[PDB]
């Protein structure tokens, strides 16, 4: 199909940036649209043949470079902070003929005026109540990212080391602490709800991974706290079964029987060596 | 049926030995 | 080379880094720089201890690695995957440990049976 | 034609593009739509022979699979020489009773 | 971290309690060693090398080989206690009751032995 | 050229139709992305004559005399919220993309229990969660009135286990008096509500449902019985011998 | 519910054990009550 | 329908395709074939038995497909879905064989005491 590299880059104004798209389908022509939020889809360079580059409707901005057929990567030179969208890139075969399309997984850019601004997602995963496994008998797992900035996270649940696709909500779009403002933090939540014979386990292991994807090595940092690279943020619960009979309080009983059972044969033995050790005598001193 | 079992289960083998002992007195208080 | 050193006591535990002698030592932890003057203060640092007080199995598992002073972990030699339970006033069950409680009980109750024994002969 | 057997949190559901016809083995429950069959738990061993047909595709063939699980919970890991030590000491502890009742009655 | 030669990972939490290695390198067949010696040839379509439940406490130096040189080490360690034991009012009152019923019967025993 | 905007909102279940209008030109092909949120857009449809075509369960419709073209979908899935782009252009190139229209599916849930539970906090951050749920999935959810009490829109989670679609919001805080009875006020709130008593419920035959057992357990509780055959057999032996010794 | 080899009617056979040994020692001594 | 034979024995799990004569026949493991490249010793093939040594519950589970030589191997629609566990020196025991095996050493004990009861009766 249609690839692109990287997913989701951050990067500080004034800095290029080169990102690759590679399409192995063997289509001639590609193109470069951008989307924000408010004006859709808009063209921005498109290239007919090997070497063949035209713009669009809006090139303000955009090197882009045609060397072989299967790759047409785009570059920015300088950045902007008005270059905060979401990019897409094309593939046609030939010219109208078979009218097709095929758009790529998309590629996301924000653009801070400073580094000082991206943070690391704070992870808090809570646990259900027991009012919800008394009346509806499901327990909802709750997780919540906040903190964090830019909006890279791709939060994922793993339930015993596997993830989980069936009873997991999570925020399509997430929140700002504060909306009103300009370099706001996101902040972003996820439901697994799961049926309450399963969460009262305490075997089962329940985690919420956030994989937040920011800075890299290769950038400069003279700030006090941590560099918030690319990174995984997560946060784990057993299952726990408040009040009932689980299979820890039976793991201890048992072991308490062990200590008491071999406690209590030693002095069967030790009593059994004894009354032995009597009747032997007992036996010389009648013969 | 399966409330706190291993207690249940242990007390019942604790008051049926002392049991057991208070019938081996009856016959050391029987017997001779 | 040489391993490291868990000296689980209670519940706290002290990781020891045995190499790198007289230089300073820090330690990542899921690469995640702890070991220093944080607010976090359930965890100390020695010359070349880490002293993690109210271990969580949750929390304060996963990977470890001592570093020396100005380094690069990624060219330490040396990982840990720590994964421990700890337990408040537990006492663990060896293979060993339970047959000495066994002939400490063995040996006391054969004391008091022998007391009780010459005691009796001695009102036979 | 993969019968896909899914595995969900604890359980496992039989799905099909139509009604599942049971054969032999585990029941399970119909769920509330139908072409989905659960089958308990895993734990508790789910064993059985099951087939559907099948629509969108295949021209309406029908197939079986059979799904047969062996989580081993009812199972006890045993050495050789512990399974030799519990048969030493009872016939230990058996002989023991023999010679109690030997001296006893001899000696009544 | 699969650069600085940190090939060896774990993938621990697991359904029972079964603890898994895993190496990063050209996989036609990975040679898994413990503490210097050799303990197993792992071809497709293994990938991870198992090192039995996390009851028996799996622990000490692990490594891989792949068709370059060893991998850096990973000390496994696990106080994964399935032994341990609280002590409650409960036991330590359980313990010393079973203890003086044992003793008095012990005593009354030995008391009409030697009377 | 110009496609109405704005998240539309169909019951489950129930014939969707939208429509883009591009009056005037001359388009030969007319074709229909769906984008999901956080995705690429993925193509559904493309035709290119006036009249009608049918694939899966969508239909494409194009109306040249009328001058828009449209898209019917039938037995509408929770599962088809999503934005749907429409384009087209000449017999070269140069594709014109509509804005877009989101289009909401909401679930019928047919058995629904609407409630404010508290969630416990994990000892690690200073939130605490009031999670309202079943919604009678016509309920609508605003946001805030504060700053420190957020508000997520309703979000329909799809169980696949239990087959059971439900609707959920979550609002976390950062401060004191914040009770889940006084945390929804900003929205409309149904009857019956049922915010919970503080004491607990404690269900003890809910709890034995789950109970697995490993290996290590079976072999343990088989040396317990082991050491009680051998605890009788010994005490047995104990018993004859001081029935022996004191028989003469 | 998945006990598996840890039912509690492994434990109450052992204790039926012990009963039955009681009934049988209770009854013998009761029949010793009847003889004098 | 004659179902698969599925024989577990510690770490070696055994398996029996019935429903074809054979004389060849091959064996499929999640579009994959198994057994018959003169290595693997852990993978045994036979006439009809196919012998998984150091079974693995995480990697060796799925869906395994018996087919004779010359059938094209997506045409088979007899499918066995096998997880299972592999616990080593361990073996499968239900309760009621355990009951039977504290009653059988409880009727051995009584039995020999009662032989010694009447074995002494005689002097």
């Known amino acids: 199909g249609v690839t692109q590299t990287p997913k989701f880059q951050v990067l500080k104004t004034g800095q290029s940036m080169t990102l690759q798209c590679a399409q192995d389908?063997?289509?001639?022509?590609m193109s470069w649209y951008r989307q924000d939020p408010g004006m859709g889809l808009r063209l921005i360079h498109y290239?007919?043949?090997?070497?063949?580059?035209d713009q669009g409707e809006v090139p303000n901005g955009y090197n882009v470079s045609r060397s072989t057929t299967e790759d047409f990567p785009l570059r920015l030179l300088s950045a902007a902070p008005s270059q905060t969208s979401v990019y897409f890139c094309?593939?046609?075969?030939?010219?109208?003929?078979?009218?097709?399309?095929?758009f790529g997984p998309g590629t996301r850019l924000t653009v801070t005026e400073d580094l000082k601004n991206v943070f690391p997602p704070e992870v808090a995963v809570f646990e259900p109540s027991e009012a919800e496994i008394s009346h509806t008998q499901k327990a909802t797992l709750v997780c919540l990212a906040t903190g964090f900035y830019p909006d890279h996270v791709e939060l994922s649940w793993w339930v015993n080391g596997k993830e989980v696709h069936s009873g997991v909500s999570t925020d399509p779009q997430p929140l700002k602490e504060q909306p009103a403002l300009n370099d706001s933090r996101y902040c972003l939540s996820s439901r697994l709800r799961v049926s309450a014979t399963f969460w009262q386990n305490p075997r089962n292991h329940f985690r919420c991974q956030v994989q937040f994807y920011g800075l890299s090595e290769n950038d400069e940092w003279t700030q006090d706290r941590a560099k918030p690279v690319t990174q995984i943020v997560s946060a784990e619960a057993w299952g726990r079964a408040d009040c009932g009979f689980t299979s820890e309080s039976y793991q201890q009983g048992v072991l308490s029987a062990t200590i008491l059972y071999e406690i209590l044969l030693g002095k069967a033995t030790l009593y059994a060596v004894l009354v032995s050790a009597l009747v032997l005598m007992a036996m010389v001193k009648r013969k | 049926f399966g409330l706190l079992d291993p207690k249940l289960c242990y007390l019942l083998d604790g008051i049926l030995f002392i049991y057991g002992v208070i019938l081996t007195a009856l016959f050391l208080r029987v017997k001779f | 080379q040489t391993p490291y050193k868990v000296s689980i006591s209670g519940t706290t535990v002290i990781l020891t880094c045995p190499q790198y002698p007289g230089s300073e030592i820090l330690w990542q932890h899921n690469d995640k720089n702890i070991g220093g003057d944080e607010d976090d203060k359930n965890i100390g640092s020695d010359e070349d201890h880490l002293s993690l007080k109210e271990f969580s199995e949750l929390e304060q598992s996963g990977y470890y690695v001592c570093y020396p002073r100005g380094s690069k972990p990624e060219d330490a030699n040396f990982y840990l995957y720590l994964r421990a339970r700890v337990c408040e006033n537990c006492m663990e069950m060896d293979v060993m440990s339970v047959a000495t409680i066994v002939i400490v009980d063995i040996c006391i109750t054969g004391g008091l049976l022998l007391l009780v024994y010459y005691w009796s002969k001695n009102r036979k | 034609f993969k019968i896909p057997i899914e595995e969900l949190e604890d359980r496992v559901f039989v799905n099909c593009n139509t009604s599942i016809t049971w054969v032999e083995g585990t029941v399970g429950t119909l769920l509330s739509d139908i072409t989905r069959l659960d089958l308990g738990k895993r734990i508790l061993d789910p064993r059985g022979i099951y087939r559907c047909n099948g629509t969108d595709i295949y021209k309406d063939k029908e197939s079986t699979v059979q799904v047969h699980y062996r989580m081993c919970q009812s199972c006890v890991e045993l050495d050789p020489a512990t399974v030799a030590g519990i048969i030493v000491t009872d016939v230990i502890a058996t002989l023991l009773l023999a010679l109690g009742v030997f001296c006893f009655a001899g000696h009544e | 971290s699969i650069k600085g030669n940190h090939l060896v990972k774990v993938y621990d939490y697991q359904e029972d309690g079964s603890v898994l290695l895993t190496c990063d390198a050209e996989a036609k067949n990975i040679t898994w060693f413990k503490d210097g010696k050799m303990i197993g040839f792992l071809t497709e379509d293994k990938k991870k090398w198992n090192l039995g439940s996390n009851a028996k406490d799996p622990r000490g130096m692990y490594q891989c080989k792949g068709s370059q040189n060893k991998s850096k080490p990973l000390q496994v360690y696990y106080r994964m206690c399935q032994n341990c034991i609280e002590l409650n009012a409960a036991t330590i009152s359980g313990f010393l009751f079973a203890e003086i019923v044992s003793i008095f019967v012990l005593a009354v025993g030995v008391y009409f032995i030697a009377g | 050229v110009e496609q109405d905007p704005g998240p539309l909102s169909v019951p489950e279940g129930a014939i969707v139709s939208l429509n883009c209008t591009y009056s005037?030109?001359?388009?030969?092909?007319f074709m229909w992305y769906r984008q999901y949120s956080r995705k690429g857009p993925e193509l559904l449809m493309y035709?290119?004559?006036?009249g009608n075509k049918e694939d899966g369960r969508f239909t494409a419709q194009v109306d040249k005399s009328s001058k828009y073209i449209s898209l019917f979908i039938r037995d509408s899935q929770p599962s088809d919220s999503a934005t749907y782009l429409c384009?087209?252009?000449?017999?070269?190139?140069?594709?014109?993309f509509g804005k877009g229209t989101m289009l909401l599916v909401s679930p019928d849930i047919q058995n629904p229990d609407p409630a404010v539970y508290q969630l416990r906090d994990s000892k690690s951050s200073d939130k605490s969660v009031c999670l309202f749920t079943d919604f009678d999935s016509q309920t609508n959810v605003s946001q805030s009135k504060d700053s420190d009490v957020y508000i997520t829109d309703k979000t329909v989670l799809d169980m696949r286990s239990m087959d059971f679609k439900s609707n959920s919001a979550v609002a976390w805080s950062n401060k004191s008096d914040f009770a889940c009875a006084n945390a929804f006020n900003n929205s409309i709130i149904p009857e019956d509500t049922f915010f919970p008593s503080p004491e607990s419920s404690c269900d003890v035959k809910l709890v034995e449902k789950s109970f697995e057992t490993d290996t290590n357990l079976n072999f343990q509780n088989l040396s317990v019985i082991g050491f009680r055959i051998l605890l009788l057999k010994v005490a047995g032996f104990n018993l004859l011998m001081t029935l022996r010794l004191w028989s003469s | 519910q998945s006990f598996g080899l840890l039912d509690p009617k492994l434990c109450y056979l052992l204790d039926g054990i012990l009963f039955i040994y009681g009934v049988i020692l209770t009854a013998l001594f009761l029949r010793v009550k009847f003889s004098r | 329908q004659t179902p698969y034979k599925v024989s577990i024995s510690g770490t070696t799990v055994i398996l029996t395709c019935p429903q074809y004569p054979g004389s060849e026949i091959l064996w499929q493991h999640n579009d994959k074939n198994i057994g018959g490249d003169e290595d693997d010793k852990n993978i045994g093939s036979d006439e009809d038995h196919l012998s998984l040594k150091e079974f693995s519950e995480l990697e060796q589970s799925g869906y395994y497909v018996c087919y004779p030589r010359g059938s094209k191997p997506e045409d088979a629609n007899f499918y066995l879905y096998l997880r299972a566990r592999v616990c080593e020196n361990c073996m499968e025991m239900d309760v009621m064989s355990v009951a039977t095996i504290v009653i059988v050493d409880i009727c051995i004990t009584g039995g020999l005491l009662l032989l010694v009861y009447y074995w002494s009766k005689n002097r």
């Open positions: 384009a087209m252009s000449k017999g070269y190139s140069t594709l014109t």
């Open positions: 005037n030109s001359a388009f030969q092909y």
């Open positions: 389908m063997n289509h001639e022509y």
């Open positions: 035709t290119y004559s006036s």
């Open positions: 290239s007919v043949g090997a070497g063949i580059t």
């Open positions: 094309a593939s046609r075969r030939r010219q109208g003929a078979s009218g097709e399309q095929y």
